C-alpha cells in the first residue's frame, strides 16, 4: 500500500550466483526489459539527463524501447536506443550473504536524487552492512567548492552503474 515497488531481498541457494539485476550485478548483454519495468532512461533535456521511466515496449527490429517518463503532470513518451536504458535492480542484495553484489566505496554510480525523478552522478560513500540499510552516496554538485554533496542515503532500488 505505502511502498509500491519495494524490492525483494535476493536469497540464493548454495552454488547460485547473485543474478543479473540483483543489486550491482549487471544485466546480461542481450537483456530486454518487460512492459512495466522501471529503468533509468537517458533523454534530451534543455543537455541530457537520466530520468526514471517505465518501459512501454521494445522492438527487436530496431532495438529501441518506448518508455514513459513517470512524472506527476502525466506521462511523456520517448523512443530510445537500448544504449540509453539501464534496467533498475529487481532484487536488493543482502550484505550479509552476497556482499559482492553491492557497489563499493568510491565507485561512480547513477543515483536518484531526493525529491526528483532523475538520476545523477555520485560516488559511493558506504555500501550497506545490513539488508535493512541503504547506500550512502556523495552526489556531484558543482555549487560546492569541493564538488560533492554531504553523504545522502539512496536505496539499492535507485542506484545503478554509470
Amino acid at each position: 500500500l505505502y511502498f509500491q515497488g519495494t524490492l525483494p531481498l535476493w536469497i540464493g541457494k548454495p552454488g547460485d550466483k547473485p543474478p543479473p539485476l540483483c543489486g550491482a550485478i549487471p544485466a546480461s548483454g542481450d537483456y530486454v526489459a518487460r512492459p512495466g519495468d522501471k529503468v533509468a532512461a537517458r533523454v534530451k533535456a534543455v543537455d541530457e539527463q537520466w530520468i526514471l521511466a517505465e518501459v512501454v515496449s521494445y522492438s527487436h527490429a530496431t532495438n529501441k524501447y518506448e518508455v514513459d517518463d513517470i512524472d506527476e503532470e502525466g506521462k511523456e513518451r520517448h523512443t530510445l536506443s537500448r544504449r540509453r536504458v539501464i534496467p533498475l535492480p529487481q532484487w536488493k542484495a543482502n550484505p550479509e550473504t552476497d556482499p559482492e553484489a553491492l557497489f563499493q566505496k568510491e565507485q561512480l554510480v547513477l543515483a536518484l536524487y531526493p525529491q526528483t525523478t532523475c538520476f545523477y552522478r555520485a560516488l559511493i560513500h558506504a555500501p550497506p552492512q545490513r539488508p535493512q540499510d541503504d547506500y550512502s552516496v556523495l552526489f556531484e554538485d558543482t555549487s560546492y567548492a569541493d564538488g560533492y554533496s554531504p553523504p545522502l542515503n539512496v536505496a539499492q532500488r535507485y542506484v545503478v552503474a554509470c
Binding site: 539527463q49 526514471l52 512524472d71 525529491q115 526528483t116 532523475c118
Partner: peptide, 4 residues
C-alpha cells in the same frame, strides 16, 4: 521529469 522532476529535476533537482
Amino acid at each position: 521529469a522532476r529535476t533537482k
